[PDB]
Amino acid sequence: PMDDEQVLRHLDQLVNDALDFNSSELSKQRSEALKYYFGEPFGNERPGKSGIVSRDVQETVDWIMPSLMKVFTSGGQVVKYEPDTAEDVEQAEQETEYVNYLFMRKNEGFKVMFDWFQDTLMMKTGVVKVYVEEVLKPTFIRKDKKKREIKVLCVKPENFLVDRLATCIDDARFLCHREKYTVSDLRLLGVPEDVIEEANREVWASECYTLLDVDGDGISELRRILYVGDYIISNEPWDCRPFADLNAYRIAHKFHGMSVYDKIRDIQEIRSVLMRNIMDNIYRTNQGETPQLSGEVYGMLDRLEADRGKRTGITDRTRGAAMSVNQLMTAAEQQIDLIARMFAETGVKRLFQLLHDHAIKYQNQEEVFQLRGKWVAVNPANWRERSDLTVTVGIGNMNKDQQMLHLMRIWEMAQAVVGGGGLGVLVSEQNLYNILKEVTENAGYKDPDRFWTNPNSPEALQAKAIREQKE
């Protein structure tokens, strides 16, 4: 109640505690993870002898990143709505195309989400921050004034202090984001003085999102504070935290989740020590009477790949009737599927966040989605729903399998029925439109290459209803 300065010291104490805990624990964990990733010596490499370290997490990343790239960065069909059936063609595909054509294709493409996966994998936490800027440079036709725009960036998760008792995104009572915000940004803000920290004095700044109440009442909503150096700040009530804090494994109820290093450290250790023992054996055999050993050790070497086989990389070969249907049961129940699954729903929250961040006010922009025309999306409905089913453990039928199955089955059916029964009884051109259309989006040429629409058109009456009837 009526707090103006005690909030500053309370936030400073929270920042210090988060610094201590997060820095010590998570920083040491990620340093160990990086040393394992980079093949750095584990410290047990005694001097005077080779301490070669074999990297194992790196190739695991090498297999699993491209799978994510296909399952996410492939078209705008990844995530949908399925809203009320009547009110879908008005906005559903329109809003979905807007949000994905913004995020991809307008917000540094895959780079932000690529680094998001990188952070959630190597360094145990993948989180990004959504923010706004102003568009400038009009003609003073092309008057680009008063336009404001929304970006998202990696938060540099090394600078993402947060209370450890959250275990979820919408549970943290104190969110800290550390940045530089150099003296140019300070003069843009208008502060005349400086802090402990040549014009550019490498100053450091921070931003805090936390629930508080300085109005002499009950606990109010989120508050955004531009706590830089205990100086002029930008205090403002907030509505939604734009963070996603991926854990990459959905660990038990804690804010951050364990990484690939936390599970393959033992495998890397055993591989490195056994190969070092192999080279030491080769040495002692070269100098030499010490009895020799057997190659069966190398045989166990093999199952270490099966170890990466048993953890994540079940596809030891290139890929793990009708020639191995469903791509051989998704390469014998590939786990990356479920991985993509939770990653998808994480993006779901982000897909909500930006939507609200866009549902307030952006601009009068239109879409080039297969056609000209899109209403002003500054006042849409949120629809309070989001769907990521068709790319994962749900329907999730990847391109080629459903492609070949549907095409050959419906084509043999169509020819058989046309010969025997006819087009009238079963599917007709009204739905042969969709028959062509699934192929169109299978090869990615939906509207422009092939229209093939003919539902009820001026060409329909003259072709389907005049000459096809009087022929």
Give the Cα separation of 78 and 379 in Å (integer): 24
Nearer to a copy of itself, 240 or 432 (CB): 432
Nearer to a copy of itself, 226 or 399 (CB): 399
Is 146:276 a contact under the CB 8 Å cutoff? no
Residue 238's H or E segment, with its range, is: strand 236-238
Nearer to a copy of itself, 19 or 75 (CB): 75
Tokens of 263: 């599970």
At 437, which amino acid appears?
Answer: K
Nearer to a copy of itself, 19 or 300 (CB): 300
SS3 320: coil
Nearer to a copy of itself, 196 or 216 (CB): 216
Nearer to a copy of itself, 130 or 212 (CB): 212
Nearer to a copy of itself, 156 or 224 (CB): 156
How many CB atoms neighbour CB 122 within 10 A? 21
Give the Cα separation of 459 and 376 in Å (integer): 32
Residue (of 6, 27, 17, 12) closest to 163 by Cα position: 17
Cβ of residue 133: shortest distance to a copy of itself, in angstroms? Answer: 13
Tokens of 68: 């994510």
Residue 243 sits at φ, ψ, to 5 deg, of -140, 160
Positive/negative CA dihedral, 346, 131, 184, 113 = positive
Is 376:364 a contact under the CB 8 Å cutoff? yes
Cβ of residue 301: shortest distance to a copy of itself, in angstroms? Answer: 8
Cβ of residue 60: shortest distance to a copy of itself, in angstroms? Answer: 9
SS3 81: coil
Cβ of residue 391: shortest distance to a copy of itself, in angstroms? Answer: 13
Give the Cα separation of 196 and 228 in Å (integer): 11
Cβ of residue 277: shortest distance to a copy of itself, in angstroms? Answer: 6
Cβ of residue 75: shortest distance to a copy of itself, in angstroms? Answer: 7
Cβ of residue 456: shortest distance to a copy of itself, in angstroms? Answer: 12
Residue 297's H or E segment, with its range, is: helix 296-311
Nearer to a copy of itself, 23 or 285 (CB): 285
Is 419:368 a contact under the CB 8 Å cutoff? no
Cβ of residue 115: shortest distance to a copy of itself, in angstroms? Answer: 7
